[PDB]
Write a protein that binds this DNA or RNA. Sequence first.
DNA 1: CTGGGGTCCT
DNA 2: AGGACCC
Length: 379
Amino acid sequence: SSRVIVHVDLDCFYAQVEMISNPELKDKPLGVQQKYLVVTCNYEARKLGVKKLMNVRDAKEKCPQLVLVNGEDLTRYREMSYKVTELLEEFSPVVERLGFDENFVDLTEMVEKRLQQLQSDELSAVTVSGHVYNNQSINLLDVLHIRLLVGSQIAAEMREAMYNQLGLTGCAGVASNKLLAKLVSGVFKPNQQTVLLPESCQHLIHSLNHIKEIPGIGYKTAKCLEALGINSVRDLQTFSPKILEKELGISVAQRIQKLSFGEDNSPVILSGPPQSFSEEDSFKKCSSEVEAKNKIEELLASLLNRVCQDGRKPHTVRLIIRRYGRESRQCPIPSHVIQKLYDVMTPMVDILMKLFRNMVNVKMPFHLTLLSVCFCNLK
DNA sequence: CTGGGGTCCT
DNA sequence: AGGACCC
Ligand SMILES: Nc1ccn([C@H]2C[C@H](O)[C@@H](COP(=O)(O)NP(=O)(O)OP(=O)(O)O)O2)c(=O)n1
Ligand SMILES: [Mn+2]
Ligand SMILES: [Mn+2]
Ligand SMILES: [Mn+2]
């Protein structure tokens, strides 16, 4: 029943891409800016006190010589993201993406194949690659330890191929489920890997200082838990199941409590091709609808290129706005438009404008801060 | 001085 | 259509 899972997370991903493009940025402290947000920075900048998701002005205040590069266009990072996923799919076909810079891979089948090839003399020769969490002792007669060590070897080969083939460094964690692999992948950063033997699971889980650090417990759930006197992992572990269900629902309650024990039965799912393609534009003000129409047309031009590139056709379109708290309207895409994928621009513009005005009233003044377009329902 | 994306559930 | 979650 026991699995071997790996989780790979990339070092300062966006910054890493920018440093690959312009090597002049390699040794200077580097931040990647999106409007007023330094969304990540390289490790030289983190030495100087820059943190991820800092304000531009807090960033330059803590580090005035910070070099900033614009990262509002995700094209190059998206390309790199999928190159990493495809490389990992060479190892095992079933690879789960999380965001742009993280992948899970279920190594179980691979581990077993490698050990079936091994003879009894060399089971004694199996060595860890990288760090062992909590420097736990390895017991070579424990088959779980052996399997996780082989998993750590496969993780090292993976990171070495990402570097040799794509020039990318990242951290990996090897553990027995997705949650533990993802928690352990970050223990030694950057560009290192860690493996978690079962006896250390509780240690890893209690090393966290608040429940929001558990993937699956977000802003709102954390708030509700804090209103219940639950702040530590052990608080959640020892809390009443029944009160928890009543407060958050049965699924949320049971899942997050199991998580608080380090238990996670969820499988590694094949992410495959994207389920949707969207673009966003943020701004201080949009009040003229011919302006709004310009913004929109700008968005769609790029999305039409990308949709064409993938070679599938979307069967739904959505328009999203935020007023001076987000709202959307969607509709199907007419079949002749779909088959045309010819001037597909103009019809799509008219459709999206009709949705626009369904949501906002021009006859009245309006203040719009975010305008976004999503193409989903691909086939 | 709070981006620009994604997933699945309800 | 919105909401929760992830990065
Ligand atoms: N809220 C967020 C989180 C991440 N990102 C982008 C920028 C990051 O470089 C990239 C990966 O996210 P991340 O792993 O959380 N941080 P990053 O990889 O930059 O640094 P590490 O701490 O992982 O080395 O996604 C974002 O644009 N908005
Ligand atoms: Mn990440
Ligand atoms: Mn990362
Ligand atoms: Mn969380």
